[PDB]
Write an enzyme that holds these catalytic residues in place. Structure first.
Site, PDB file in Angstrom:
ATOM      1  N   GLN D  11       0.825  -1.204   0.000  1.00 51.29           N
ATOM      2  CA  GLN D  11       0.000   0.000   0.000  1.00 51.29           C
ATOM      3  C   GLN D  11       0.855   1.246   0.000  1.00 51.29           C
ATOM      4  OE1 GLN D  11      -0.435  -2.685   1.719  1.00 51.29           O
ATOM      5  NE2 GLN D  11      -2.190  -2.649   3.106  1.00 51.29           N
ATOM      6  N   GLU D  71      -3.356  -6.983  -1.167  1.00 52.26           N
ATOM      7  CA  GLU D  71      -4.730  -6.577  -0.908  1.00 52.26           C
ATOM      8  C   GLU D  71      -5.339  -6.025  -2.186  1.00 52.26           C
ATOM      9  OE1 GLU D  71      -2.087  -5.761   0.630  1.00 52.26           O
ATOM     10  OE2 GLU D  71      -2.233  -6.124   2.779  1.00 52.26           O
ATOM     11  N   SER D 140       8.619  -0.448   1.985  1.00 48.07           N
ATOM     12  CA  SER D 140       8.599   0.386   3.178  1.00 48.07           C
ATOM     13  C   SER D 140       9.174  -0.399   4.348  1.00 48.07           C
ATOM     14  CB  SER D 140       7.180   0.849   3.502  1.00 48.07           C
ATOM     15  OG  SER D 140       6.374  -0.256   3.865  1.00 48.07           O
ATOM     16  N   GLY D 144       2.678  -2.258   6.677  1.00 55.79           N
ATOM     17  CA  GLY D 144       1.911  -3.420   7.088  1.00 55.79           C
ATOM     18  C   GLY D 144       2.322  -4.703   6.387  1.00 55.79           C
ATOM     19  N   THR D 145       2.799  -4.614   5.141  1.00 61.50           N
ATOM     20  CA  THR D 145       3.325  -5.810   4.480  1.00 61.50           C
ATOM     21  C   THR D 145       4.740  -5.668   3.943  1.00 61.50           C
ATOM     22  OG1 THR D 145       2.403  -5.258   2.295  1.00 61.50           O
ATOM     23  CG2 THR D 145       1.010  -6.543   3.788  1.00 61.50           C
ATOM     24  N   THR D 179       2.569   5.843  13.082  1.00 59.04           N
ATOM     25  CA  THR D 179       1.302   5.384  12.533  1.00 59.04           C
ATOM     26  C   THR D 179       0.939   3.984  13.007  1.00 59.04           C
ATOM     27  OG1 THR D 179       2.467   4.640  10.551  1.00 59.04           O
ATOM     28  CG2 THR D 179       1.472   6.830  10.500  1.00 59.04           C
ATOM     29  N   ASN D 206       8.640  11.669   5.702  1.00 55.04           N
ATOM     30  CA  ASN D 206       7.538  12.470   5.180  1.00 55.04           C
ATOM     31  C   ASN D 206       7.326  13.767   5.951  1.00 55.04           C
ATOM     32  OD1 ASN D 206       6.799  10.706   7.307  1.00 55.04           O
ATOM     33  ND2 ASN D 206       4.630  11.110   6.894  1.00 55.04           N
ATOM     34  N   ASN D 228       4.102  12.179  -3.714  1.00 55.42           N
ATOM     35  CA  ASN D 228       4.520  11.281  -4.774  1.00 55.42           C
ATOM     36  C   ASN D 228       5.182  12.037  -5.912  1.00 55.42           C
ATOM     37  OD1 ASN D 228       3.079   9.638  -3.069  1.00 55.42           O
ATOM     38  ND2 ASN D 228       1.325   9.447  -4.454  1.00 55.42           N
ATOM     39  N   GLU D 254      28.698   3.517 -10.637  1.00 50.37           N
ATOM     40  CA  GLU D 254      29.535   4.542 -10.024  1.00 50.37           C
ATOM     41  C   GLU D 254      29.004   4.934  -8.657  1.00 50.37           C
ATOM     42  OE1 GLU D 254      28.855   3.958 -12.883  1.00 50.37           O
ATOM     43  OE2 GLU D 254      30.439   4.483 -14.306  1.00 50.37           O
TER      44      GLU D 254
HETATM   45  N1  LIG Z   1       6.126   4.287   0.886  1.00 46.82           N
HETATM   46  C1  LIG Z   1       5.015   4.946   1.215  1.00 46.82           C
HETATM   47  N2  LIG Z   1       4.587   4.972   2.519  1.00 46.82           N
HETATM   48  C2  LIG Z   1       3.461   5.618   2.870  1.00 46.82           C
HETATM   49  C3  LIG Z   1       2.709   6.279   1.930  1.00 46.82           C
HETATM   50  N3  LIG Z   1       1.662   6.846   2.594  1.00 46.82           N
HETATM   51  C4  LIG Z   1       1.750   6.521   3.904  1.00 46.82           C
HETATM   52  N4  LIG Z   1       2.872   5.767   4.085  1.00 46.82           N
HETATM   53  C5  LIG Z   1       3.374   5.195   5.340  1.00 46.82           C
HETATM   54  O1  LIG Z   1       3.657   3.837   5.053  1.00 46.82           O
HETATM   55  C6  LIG Z   1       3.046   2.933   5.958  1.00 46.82           C
HETATM   56  C7  LIG Z   1       2.186   1.917   5.204  1.00 46.82           C
HETATM   57  O2  LIG Z   1       2.329   0.633   5.774  1.00 46.82           O
HETATM   58  P1  LIG Z   1       1.296  -0.585   5.532  1.00 46.82           P
HETATM   59  O3  LIG Z   1      -0.104  -0.045   5.598  1.00 46.82           O
HETATM   60  O4  LIG Z   1       1.525  -1.676   6.548  1.00 46.82           O
HETATM   61  O5  LIG Z   1       1.510  -1.198   4.065  1.00 46.82           O
HETATM   62  P2  LIG Z   1       1.746  -2.775   3.823  1.00 46.82           P
HETATM   63  O6  LIG Z   1       2.830  -3.402   4.671  1.00 46.82           O
HETATM   64  O7  LIG Z   1       2.095  -3.003   2.378  1.00 46.82           O
HETATM   65  O8  LIG Z   1       0.415  -3.590   4.221  1.00 46.82           O
HETATM   66  P3  LIG Z   1      -1.013  -3.054   4.723  1.00 46.82           P
HETATM   67  O9  LIG Z   1      -1.010  -2.720   6.198  1.00 46.82           O
HETATM   68  O10 LIG Z   1      -1.989  -4.183   4.535  1.00 46.82           O
HETATM   69  O11 LIG Z   1      -1.426  -1.895   3.846  1.00 46.82           O
HETATM   70  C8  LIG Z   1       2.179   3.762   6.884  1.00 46.82           C
HETATM   71  O12 LIG Z   1       2.672   3.692   8.199  1.00 46.82           O
HETATM   72  C9  LIG Z   1       2.296   5.189   6.403  1.00 46.82           C
HETATM   73  O13 LIG Z   1       2.653   6.032   7.472  1.00 46.82           O
HETATM   74  C10 LIG Z   1       3.130   6.255   0.601  1.00 46.82           C
HETATM   75  O14 LIG Z   1       2.545   6.792  -0.336  1.00 46.82           O
HETATM   76  N5  LIG Z   1       4.271   5.588   0.264  1.00 46.82           N
END
Ligand SMILES: Nc1nc2c(ncn2[C@@H]2O[C@H](COP(=O)(O)OP(=O)(O)OP(=O)(O)O)[C@@H](O)[C@H]2O)c(=O)[nH]1
Ligand SMILES: Nc1nc2c(ncn2[C@@H]2O[C@H](COP(=O)(O)OP(=O)(O)OP(=O)(O)O)[C@@H](O)[C@H]2O)c(=O)[nH]1
Ligand SMILES: Nc1nc2c(ncn2[C@@H]2O[C@H](COP(=O)(O)OP(=O)(O)OP(=O)(O)O)[C@@H](O)[C@H]2O)c(=O)[nH]1
Lengths: 46, 427, 50, 438, 438
Positions: D11, D71, D140, D144-145, D179, D206, D228, D254
């Site tokens: 996400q 998801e 990330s 969450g994932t 968060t 951020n 973004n 490089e």
């Molecule tokens: N890289 C990135 N991070 C973001 C963005 N927007 C918010 N975040 C931060 O990135 C984190 C998202 O983590 P998750 O929601 O666990 O994403 P995930 O591990 O792929 O799995 P889910 O929880 O199911 O969505 C949040 O804590 C946000 O604070 C974004 O556009 N890009």
């Protein structure tokens, strides 16, 4: 709500989705394209 | 008869050769397309030192262009004279370099060498008799050093009877760009000092200074830098292709110029630089050519010899002079400062006088000098290498490539040997 | 400065393709008839081509 | 040739790739269908686009990217959106459940059936790919994932194809913003599994983007759209060297060979100088001096670390658009003349320069103006040590009180590795300290 | 010259005969009435349609097929179909009764008063034709009636002609889905009776056809219509060499002379690579390398046999569309280099390349895409013994419990034949092992 629309007719519905669509219960027909084509082309209710 | 084959190595040498070749060609009267235009008997005759002949009057250069980045050679081919270059001499690899000297010297060069050797020996047998080879490359650039070291090493035992004129660009003493430049330069110069006989070392800080001094336009390009350096090599090569009561051969120069095997480093110098308005504010006279030639601001290769002393100097003039003025000017400088030279040798002055003035003027010159002034430069690189080596940062790549720090120790040994012998001679 | 605008790159190229025209006119043909005279040669006289 | 493969998960990591590719379409003028005008650019996927898009005879610049998500919501949304025709249909790898913010769930319960699919897709890319300089991964830390599956995938790729680079760009945890409380745990787990396989990892935050947006752009309620776009132009600047030519060309290799002195310590920071509003850019002037002072300005960093608390050992600047070498070397000389930035004794020379001619481009409906001279700065520093110090002295209380441990153990793990990670981190801080000390 | 005869026996094979002839009318533009467009193609029957039709002075192409059926239902239906006016009335030989799924009923009771008619048809067709390369017979192993009369007619044609080729494609029983428990009886009887008369029997599995279908055609309720259409295009590919010409051409005679190593063993397998949908093909590229890789991938085979656990010996490899033979031979060399395929040592080279520059053709209302590079693969490997092992370790149990034997003894048969078939299968198994072990 106060938002946009989706599902533009015929040209629509790439393969992959999960979610309900109208009258997908009569799908002896095969290609996802023709499935979705008939699905939208049959809003005949009203 | 006598001809020359040119080596255009690494990305620097690529654009250097672009400018250099178009300069020679434009002076010599060949169109970009290939259809020469009849104007000058003497160029029409002596063209064979460089240009071989196809059918119809269209001329193939005897140059070999090499690089690893395909886009570099794409841009070179895109320039106004890719059509005057040949695909035959276009050879390249696939992997990016990273400007890692060990990469350039043990892994991918190890297979890239053979094909370029085969092609160059094809052309060398095509011609009749060379005197040597002039190489354009970098010592602070990775691929140039890594490849050219191997190349010069192997050609040395290929033919032990030819002159290795070398033309290597030098990093800025104020900003070295590539942070591993100390390592690259040290490793490269290790085999440079062994294989080469004559070397010109070029640093662009003086080029920037001269851009603020006589070029006076303050909005320059590396193209303009190439313009100047290409003109300098043009001048050094003019004597061969032209008549006159002078001697031309690079060997006739070198055997006069160098006293000892371990003395190789050289200082290009140029002749009248013309500014915004000095065109119609200048008189082109023997005293002022002499003065500007000897000027320190005019000097542009490494640094002021004011700290040190001269060993030998040579000058090539090109114009309708007489011998008496140059002799009296030589006496004037000798007796104006008879101290800044070395009492060891008399007559440290070497001369050549060509009668074919360049295109646009009536008399010109070029100055080459051997002076005890490169001590500061390779001393700087000494501190660079030591202050890095004390904590072996970045060495993991080089060890992964697979050599030892001992080899580095012999490199620094040889460098300090040059330092010591320059000092022990001049002092 | 025309040399310095010559030094202003774009990294150009050109290539080719067939599929879209191929499909657009896939499976169509024109049909046309013609005649060749032959009595020039002292053996043959006529024959028809399509 | 000069191509690389793009990867996005999570996400967190989906809208960012969305925006980056939305920028990537402009400079080649990709119609949102995927077809060029009647003018001539198509071929065997061989032109300026080839570094990103594979346009074989189809006349459709098919991207070399891979979006994977557990998801269906957002992926189905983008499949409903604008460029779903441009995107490769089954290439969009989709799952039906989450990782529940649990790294160990994402690494042992559900990852095991997706790796085969992703491997098939990546190698079927690789076969037709010819150059393939490297990968470009987007994930990330505290996601969450994006923790577990990312770690496992980087494990498999690093152990199967060990003869090429890997560039990891990630969103670092917010120092004094949270968060989710799982973030300490999963962040340190991911880091300790990565550092021994990661090559160059660039962390972004951020809160600094937030502060910047009204610092000089002066839109006080930006969004993810703006975030973004900013990170997009970052990656556009870093890929410009591959996209086109310049005075001197630089490459990811490089970057790898230069910016990092030692293993372990490979965590640089960026900064993009001329972020500024439309009318500001229009009626204000730009040049190398001020833009370089801006790139080294200590308040514009996207990590709330203080360089004058830290130090410096290596730097690399990439200039895009009309420049000349003269003023560049003049400005860098002046910066060396300055006495506040304290370069280490180690490298008396520490500046990797690069030039590209092609100016950066606006995006339609973009919060930017037209640029003439852009400079992206990538610096390595030691100040980041305070951030990891923050993370560890927060993790101490949690592992002391052993909270939420049922969540992990019931789904299948144990505590030896959780113990191990803390001294891995401590190793990182002690490494920072010893190398920073002259 | 070059023209063959078609046979379709069994309400199993009726749909597929119908479907293949439907497809065959397209590429020559054969209007469903029986005439052409305003174009001129009518004559004595020497032009492109010469190999499947005999069009006389009134311009009505005559299909060279024989539709023999035992239950009036399907034959009446197809004869009520669209192409009824195209077809020939007593080429549509119709019967009243069935075999009650019983091979012996279909082999000793019913057909002995129908083979006279069918032989009369085939002989008056053979007299008029001249090329007579051979017969192409369709039947069904899981056949209620497509088995007994199949065996009887093939016996009679073997004993009346002995100097031409016989090609037969038979739907295999499903490994685990038995539409009838009469399968263990009838299948092995047909096999052991055919082994010494059949030339090169080919087979396919409809479950696998469905598997591929929902794999890459992404269709969730496909039909018999699709199942039949695909195999129709398969036979189109294998007779393209007859249809058009090319750089080189190959024929059933060459297949007979080259694809069978030893007597008995003539059971190959088939694969077609670019079975793809509209948008997949439209915006995903096709080329020899990846298509050959796909056709050598284990899961694309339409019969459930792991290639790895067996051993390859034979390959024949036919391209349709545009292709430059340089990449063809380069790709096949790369395949030879690839370790994962485990050739036997007897034939260090075992490949049969064939080229036709004619592209394959789509069908209206169709579900295949447009193709400019395609290939049919027809190969032989040793792994196939698994299916015989499966059917024999079913039949041993069912025979030792003599289930349903009352039926067959009542309709008048005995057990020596049962034995003979059993140990014939036993012999084929050890022959397989002997040829396999190098
Ligand atoms: N890289 C990135 N991070 C973001 C963005 N927007 C918010 N975040 C931060 O990135 C984190 C998202 O983590 P998750 O929601 O666990 O994403 P995930 O591990 O792929 O799995 P889910 O929880 O199911 O969505 C949040 O804590 C946000 O604070 C974004 O556009 N890009
Ligand atoms: N041709 C050219 N060379 C330049 C220019 N500016 C700097 N150089 C120098 O040219 C050097 C090396 O060129 P090459 O001979 O091809 O060396 P290399 O092995 O490719 O190593 P690098 O180019 O340094 O990565 C670089 O290190 C630069 O320092 C320029 O504008 N044109
Ligand atoms: N070839 C083909 N086979 C089919 C079709 N539909 C089902 N099948 C399979 O084909 C076999 C049909 O063979 P049989 O049912 O014995 O046909 P038959 O011997 O001609 O006589 P019947 O029992 O009357 O049908 C079955 O095993 C099915 O699994 C079809 O349309 N075409």
């Amino acid at each position: 709500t106060q938002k946009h629309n989706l599902f533009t007719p015929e040209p629509h519905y790439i393969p992959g989705y999960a979610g309900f669509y109208p009258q997908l219960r009569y799908q002896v027909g095969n290609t996802y394209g023709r499935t979705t084509a008939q699905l939208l082309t049959d809003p005949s209710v009203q | 008869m006598r001809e020359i084959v040119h080596l255009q190595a690494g990305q620097c040498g690529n654009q250097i050769g672009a400018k250099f070749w178009e300069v020679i060609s434009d002076e010599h009267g060949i169109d970009p397309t290939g259809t020469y235009h009849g104007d000058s008997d003497l160029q029409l005759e002596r063209i064979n030192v460089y240009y071989n002949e196809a059918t119809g009057g269209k001329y193939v250069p005897r140059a070999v262009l090499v690089d690893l980045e395909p886009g570099t050679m794409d841009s070179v081919r895109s320039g106004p004279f890719g059509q005057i270059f040949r695909p035959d001499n276009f050879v390249f690899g696939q992997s990016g370099a990273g400007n890692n000297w060990a990469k350039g010297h043990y892994t991918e060069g190890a297979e890239l060498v053979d094909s370029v050797l085969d092609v160059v020996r094809k052309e060398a047998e095509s011609c009749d008799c060379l005197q040597g080879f002039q190489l354009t490359h970098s010592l602070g650039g990775g691929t140039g050093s890594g490849m050219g070291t191997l190349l010069i090493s192997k050609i040395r035992e290929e033919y032990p009877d030819r002159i290795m004129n070398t033309f290597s660009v030098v990093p800025s003493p104020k900003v070295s760009d590539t942070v591993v430049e100390p390592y690259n330069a040290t490793l490269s110069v290790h085999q440079l000092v062994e294989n080469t006989d004559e070397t010109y070392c070029i640093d662009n800080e003086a080029l920037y200074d001269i851009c603020f001094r006589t070029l006076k336009l303050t909005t320059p390009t590396y193209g303009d830098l190439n313009h100047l350096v290409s003109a300098t090599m043009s001048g050094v090569t003019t004597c061969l292709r032209f008549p006159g009561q002078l001697n031309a051969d690079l060997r006739k120069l070198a055997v006069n110029m160098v006293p000892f095997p371990r003395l190789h480093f050289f200082m290009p110098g140029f002749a009248p630089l013309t500014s915004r308005g000095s065109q119609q504010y200048r008189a082109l006279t023997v005293p002022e050519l002499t003065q500007q030639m000897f000027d320190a601001k005019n000097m542009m290769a490494a640094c002021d010899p004011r700290h040190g002393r001269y060993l030998t100097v040579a000058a090539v003039f090109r114009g309708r002079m007489s011998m008496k003025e140059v002799d009296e000017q030589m006496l004037n400088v000798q007796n104006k400062n008879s101290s800044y030279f070395v009492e060891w040798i008399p007559n440290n002055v070497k001369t050549a006088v060509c009668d074919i003035p360049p295109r646009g003027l009536k008399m010109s010159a070029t100055f080459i000098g051997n002076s005890t002034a490169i001590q500061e430069l390779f001393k700087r690189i000494s501190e660079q290498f030591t202050a890095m080596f004390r904590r072996k940062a970045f060495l993991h790549w080089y060890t992964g490539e697979g050599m030892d720090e001992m080899e580095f120790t012999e490199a620094e040994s040889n460098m300090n040997d040059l330092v010591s012998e320059y000092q022990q001679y001049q002092d | 400065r025309e040399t310095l605008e010559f030094v202003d790159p774009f990294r150009p190229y050109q290539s080719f393709d067939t599929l879209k025209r191929f499909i657009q006119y896939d499976g169509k043909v024109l049909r046309f008839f013609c005649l060749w005279d032959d009595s020039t040669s002292l053996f043959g006289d006529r024959r028809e081509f399509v | 040739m000069r191509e690389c493969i793009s990867i996005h998960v999570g996400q967190a990591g989906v809208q960012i790739g969305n925006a980056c590719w939305e920028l990537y379409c402009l400079e080649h003028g990709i119609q949102p269908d995927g077809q060029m005008p009647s003018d001539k650019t198509i071929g065997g996927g061989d032109d300026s686009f080839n570094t990103f898009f594979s346009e074989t005879g189809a006349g459709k610049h098919v991207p070399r990217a891979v979006f994977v998500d557990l998801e269906p919501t957002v992926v189905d949304e983008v499949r409903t959106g604008t460029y779903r025709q441009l995107f490769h249909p089954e290439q969009l790898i989709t799952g039906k459940e989450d990782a529940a913010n649990n790294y160990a769930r994402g690494h042992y319960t559900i990852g095991k059936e997706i790796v085969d699919l992703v491997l098939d897709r990546i190698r079927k890319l690789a076969d037709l790919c010819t150059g393939l300089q490297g990968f470009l991964i987007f994930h990330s830390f505290g996601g969450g994932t994006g923790s577990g599956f990312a770690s496992l995938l980087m494990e498999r790729l690093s152990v199967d194809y060990g003869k090429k680079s890997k560039l990891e760009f990630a969103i670092y945890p917010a120092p004094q913003v949270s968060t989710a409380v799982v973030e300490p745990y999963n962040s340190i787990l991911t880091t300790h599994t990565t550092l021994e396989h990661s090559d160059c990892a660039f962390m972004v935050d951020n809160e600094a983007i937030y502060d910047i947006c009204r610092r000089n752009l002066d839109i006080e309620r930006p969004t993810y759209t703006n975030l973004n776009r900013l990170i997009g132009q970052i990656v556009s600047s870093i890929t410009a060297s591959l996209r086109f030519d310049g005075a001197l060309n630089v490459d990811l290799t490089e970057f790898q060979t230069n910016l990092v002195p030692y293993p372990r310590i490979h965590f640089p920071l960026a900064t993009y100088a001329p972020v500024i509003s439309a009318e500001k850019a229009y009626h204000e002037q730009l040049s190398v001096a001020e833009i370089t002072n801006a790139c080294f300005e200590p308040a514009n960093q996207m990590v709330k670390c203080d360089p004058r608390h830290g130090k410096y050992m290596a730097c690399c600047m990439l200039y895009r658009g009309d420049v000349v070498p003269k003023d560049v070397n003049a400005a860098i000389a002046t910066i060396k003349t300055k006495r506040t930035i304290q370069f280490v004794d180690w490298c008396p020379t520490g500046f990797k320069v690069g030039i590209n001619y092609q100016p950066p481009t606006v995006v339609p409906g973009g919060d930017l103006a037209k640029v003439q001279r852009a400079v992206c700065m990538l610096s390595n520093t030691t100040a980041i040590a305070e951030a990891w110090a923050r993370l560890d002295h927060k993790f101490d209380l949690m592992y002391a009180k052993r909270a939420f441990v049922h969540w992990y153990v019931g789904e299948g793990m144990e505590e030896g590795e959780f113990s191990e990670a803390r001294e891995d981190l401590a190793a990182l801080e002690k490494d920072y300290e010893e190398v920073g000390v002259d």
